[PDB]
Design a protein around this ligand. Structure first.
Ligand code: HEM
Ligand SMILES: *[C@@H]1O[C@H](CO)[C@@H](O)[C@H](O)[C@H]1NC(C)=O
Ligand SMILES: *[C@@H]1O[C@H](CO)[C@@H](O)[C@H](O)[C@H]1NC(C)=O
Ligand SMILES: *[C@@H]1O[C@H](CO)[C@@H](O)[C@H](O)[C@H]1NC(C)=O
Ligand SMILES: [Mg+2]
Length: 326
């Protein structure tokens, strides 16, 4: 029942993706949008179902076709999200809030909470979304976006680029340390927090230019309105995180968390970091996934095993597959 992960694009050239077949349309009542401007934009152009509920294969196809996200990155991100936020029996994932549209729920402690669920995939120090502690981890936030604009003005000549990314990533960390007593910055989120800052430079820049300089009109169009610029061409080749090394080198951090009070950031030696990427995969499967499904029945175990094989297809060569359910 779970479809096979799509393979890479047969033709990965730049092309018009804001085309007649994929027009932007406003949200209808019930349409779900969430913390990811990429998926949101794909849904609002009909690369994904416009109500924001999709299969993993639909998501992989959409991120490749609409933005030229590369295949391994698409597979890893999509199956990680599906394993912790999606319905494994119906093969459906919400790109935002929890919804009955993903079908009958599995037993607790699984939450099938969509991408909005804090602490499974989604986490703190996002760029244009607030921390979950402050009440809303998914809607566009104007104040946070205006800080992104200010950091683009100060470090990118008015454009968002990897230098801006390195300064803003660290600012959002510092602000969470100072204000969120529950701030968590370990393991999966420690990786995605750096990766996500490269995506506007690598994937929201029109592919005919591909110069890594994102202007603020296009930025607002994607980040707030889920809308491709008029005449938007996708990137001219598959990519995801290239340049993340610049973001890390700007302000190298250790994984850690506040310990129930502000300004109490405490390094966690059990966390993976960029020196142990295989450990991040192993903890995601052995701890995060297994904690949601500690003792699955037969149909759920088979769906878990299938999606865990698919997830491993997106893991970088050199890691070893782990089997929490045999
Ligand atoms: C392949 C499947 C994808 C999944 C499952 C996914 C999921 C998510 C989630 C859950 C977040 C919230 C992260 C957090 O708060 O910890 C996020 C953030 C983000 N995603 Fe995606 N995403 C995907 C692909 C893409 C693509 C193709 C783009 C194209 C640019 C993109 C751009 C972004 C950006 C820029 C952010 C950061 C938003 C912010 O901090 O303001 N994502 N994604
Ligand atoms: C947006 O973010 C600001 C700054 O962190 C916060 O004070 C505010 O409550 C957030 N929510 C809005 C503006 O709806
Ligand atoms: C970002 O833009 C600023 C100003 O144009 C420039 O000095 C810096 O080199 C740029 N960084 C990248 C990674 O393009
Ligand atoms: C994950 O579990 C496998 C056995 O299922 C084990 O070999 C591996 O060391 C574990 N990794 C962890 C706990 O990080
Ligand atoms: Mg977040």
């Amino acid at each position: 029942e779970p479809g096979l992960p799509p393979g890479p694009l047969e033709n990965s050239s730049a092309k018009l993706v804001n085309d007649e077949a994929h027009p932007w349309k406003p949200l209808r009542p019930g349409d779900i949008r969430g913390p990811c401007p990429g998926l949101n934009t794909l849904a609002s152009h009909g690369y994904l179902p416009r109500n924001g509920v999709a299969t993993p294969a639909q998501i992989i196809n959409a991120v490749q076709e609409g933005f030229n996200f590369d295949n391994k990155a698409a597979i890893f991100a999509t199956y990680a999200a599906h394993l912790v936020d999606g319905n494994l029996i119906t093969d459906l994932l919400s790109i935002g809030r929890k919804t009955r549209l993903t079908g009958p729920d599995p037993p607790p402690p699984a939450s099938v909470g969509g991408l909005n669920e804090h602490g499974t995939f989604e986490g703190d120090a996002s760029m244009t979304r607030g921390d979950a502690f402050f009440g809303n981890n998914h809607d566009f936030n104007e104040t946070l976006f205006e800080q992104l604009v200010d950091y683009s003005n100060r470090f990118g000549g008015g454009k968002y680029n990897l230098t801006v990314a390195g300064e803003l990533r660290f600012k959002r960390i510092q602000d969470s340390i100072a204000t969120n007593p529950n701030f968590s910055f370990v393991d999966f989120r420690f990786f995605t927090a750096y990766a996500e800052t490269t995506f506007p430079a690598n994937l929201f820049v029109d592919g005919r230019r591909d110069d890594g300089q994102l202007d603020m009109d296009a930025a607002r169009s994607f980040f707030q309105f889920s809308r491709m610029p008029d005449d938007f061409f996708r990137a001219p080749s598959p990519r995801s995180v290239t340049g993340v090394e610049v973001v890390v080198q700007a302000h190298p951090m250790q994984p850690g968390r506040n310990v129930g009070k502000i300004n109490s950031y405490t390094v966690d030696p059990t966390s993976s970091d960029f020196s142990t990427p295989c450990l991040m995969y192993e903890k995601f499967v052995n701890i995060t996934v297994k904690s949601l499904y500690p003792n699955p029945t037969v149909q759920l175990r088979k769906a878990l095993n299938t999606n865990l094989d698919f997830l491993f297809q997106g893991v970088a060569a050199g890691c070893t597959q782990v089997f929490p359910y045999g």
